[PDB]
Structure formats: structure tokens, C-alpha cells
């Protein structure tokens, strides 16, 4: 199946309190494997996954140099943005960046990304063809014109289409154990009465990986599109994820509703009903 690598960076200015803070994180799919913190003691790139340990000191040197440089370059940028927008230096501002690539079952290149965001909104972005940019405002328009002159795009297509994918295939093979792990979700339901004539049906999915998943409430075959409560998919804290969906059911008609679960770990979508043999039948025992 498809896979992807991503590096996320965050730079925040601290008026009257020193240098801005730079936090860089790297993921392969939903698994974090590295990080960098400018205020950190070591002041060097660090491993956040077991399979990235098996790396020579040359890796940690190169990586530290590249990311430690990205700190400098983004610190410089905040300054520039201040001038462009005529903003006061006594105020805090954020600079977010995100770059990376995608692959298919093949291990072939699919899509690339190089993007920036200032104060929570898009600033400039590399288009899908990896040959032209998308400038949000007139400030970015300048940048876009400069970057075109400096050929920043081709330097970046070189990384994305080339290096980027190589390092991803290396991590997917050198990290088979975890990275190609497909954990099915451990479902079940909970019944919660709301009033004297209505009740709530919770549908749960736990310990699943990857994080992509789909819970669907259905009544007699039709989807409870806009009558269904749903939460964000949250990390369990150990690499797996959790999620739940709910509906108010006119008490008495619980069996009419069904919960459907789709996930990469299941050889087939599930169907759960509020009864024994579907997510709640361990109460006929001791």
C-alpha cells in the first residue's frame, strides 16, 4: 500500500526573551521517528523510534547539520516577514513549514510537498507539478518572484522525487517490523440512556494502526449521515489509535441500528449490533 514521509517544523518568536524556538519533527506515516528542539540540551537531532537507532554517527551529523541549518534559515525569515508586513518586533509570530513525499505499493514516487505558513495561514506553496508556486498574498508574491529567480523549485523537486523517496524506502525496509504493521481495531458498544424515551449508542474502535479508519451508523440499511456524533481520532499514546461514534436511539429500537467499521487491518468491513456476537455479550457468565 501507499506510504509517506513528512517533516513538520515550527518556529515561534519570543520578544524580549531571546531567540525564537525551533521544533522539527519527522514522521513516516503515523509513526514519529525523529525530532529537533533548539532549546534542547543536546542541540542535536534525536531518535524517537526504535528502528532509527541502527544509524551510524554520520547520519546524526548530517541530519543535525541540515535541520540545525533550517533553524537558522527560518529564524531569518521571521525577521523578513516583520519588514514585509510592517509588524512590530515586540510581538510573537509563528512560521510553520511542511515538506515530504508519497509512494505506492511499488515504492515508486507519487506526490511531493514543500509548504510554508505564517501566523496560521498559508504563505507560499509548491504546486502538485513541483514546477511552480502558489503565493497567498502580495508579500508572498515577492518571495515567489525571488524563488523563481533562484530556481528553488527544481532544487526541491530534486529532493522530493529523488532523495526523499530513497530515504523512505530505506526506512520501510529497515523498519519493516513496525512501519508495515497493520493492527485491526478492537471494537465494542456502550449503551447510555438519555431520557425516558431515548438512549445513546457509542461505537468504539481501539488499538488500531494506521490511524485512518471509518465508523458508520446505519439504520435498516441507511446511513445516519447528520444524526451521528463523532470524535477526532486520538492517539492511545503507545503507537496505536482510538475513536468512537454515537447516535441517539429511540430506546427499544437498539437492534435496528448497526455500526460499520472500515480499516486496513480488517480483511473485510465489520457490522456491529447491540447484542451477543457483535460487541457486547460477555454478561452471560460469572
Amino acid at each position: 500500500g501507499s506510504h509517506s514521509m513528512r517533516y513538520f517544523s515550527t518556529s515561534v518568536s519570543r520578544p524580549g526573551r531571546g531567540e525564537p524556538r525551533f521544533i522539527a519533527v519527522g514522521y513516516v506515516d503515523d509513526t514519529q521517528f525523529v525530532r529537533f528542539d533548539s532549546d534542547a540540551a543536546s542541540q542535536r537531532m534525536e531518535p524517537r523510534a526504535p528502528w532509527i537507532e541502527q544509524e551510524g554517527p554520520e547520519y546524526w551529523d548530517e541530519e543535525t547539520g541540515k535541520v540545525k541549518a533550517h533553524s537558522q534559515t527560518d529564524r531569518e525569515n521571521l525577521r523578513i516577514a516583520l519588514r514585509y508586513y510592517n509588524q512590530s518586533e515586540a510581538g510573537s509570530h509563528t512560521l510553520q513549514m511542511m515538506f515530504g513525499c508519497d509512494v505506492g505499493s511499488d515504492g515508486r514516487f507519487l506526490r511531493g510537498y514543500h509548504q510554508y505558513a505564517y501566523d496560521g495561514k498559508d504563505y507560499i506553496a509548491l504546486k502538485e507539478d513541483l514546477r511552480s508556486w502558489t503565493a497567498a498574498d502580495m508579500a508572498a508574491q515577492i518571495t515567489k518572484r525571488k524563488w523563481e529567480a533562484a530556481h528553488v523549485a527544481e532544487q526541491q523537486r530534486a529532493y522530493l522525487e529523488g532523495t526523499c523517496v530513497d530515504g523512505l524506502r530505506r526506512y520501510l525496509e529497515n523498519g519493516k517490523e513496525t512501519l508495515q504493521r497493520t493492527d485491526p481495531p478492537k471494537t465494542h458498544m456502550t449503551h447510555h440512556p438519555i431520557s425516558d424515551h431515548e438512549a445513546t449508542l457509542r461505537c468504539w474502535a481501539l488499538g488500531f494502526y494506521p490511524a485512518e479508519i471509518t465508523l458508520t451508523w446505519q439504520r435498516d440499511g441507511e446511513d445516519q449521515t447528520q444524526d451521528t456524533e463523532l470524535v477526532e481520532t486520538r492517539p492511545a499514546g503507545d503507537g496505536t489509535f482510538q475513536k468512537w461514534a454515537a447516535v441517539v436511539v429511540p430506546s427499544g429500537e437498539e437492534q435496528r441500528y448497526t455500526c460499520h467499521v472500515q480499516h486496513e487491518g480488517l480483511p473485510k468491513p465489520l457490522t456491529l449490533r447491540w447484542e451477543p456476537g457483535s460487541g457486547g455479550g460477555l454478561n452471560d457468565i460469572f
Binding site: 533550517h70 534559515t73 516577514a81 515577492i142 532523495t163
Partner: peptide, 9 residues
């Protein structure tokens, strides 16, 4: 493998 981010706005 991290990239080479060295462009100014």
C-alpha cells in the same frame, strides 16, 4: 532524510 531548507522569504 531531512532536506536542504535555505531559501529566504
Amino acid at each position: 532524510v531531512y532536506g536542504f531548507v535555505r531559501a529566504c522569504l
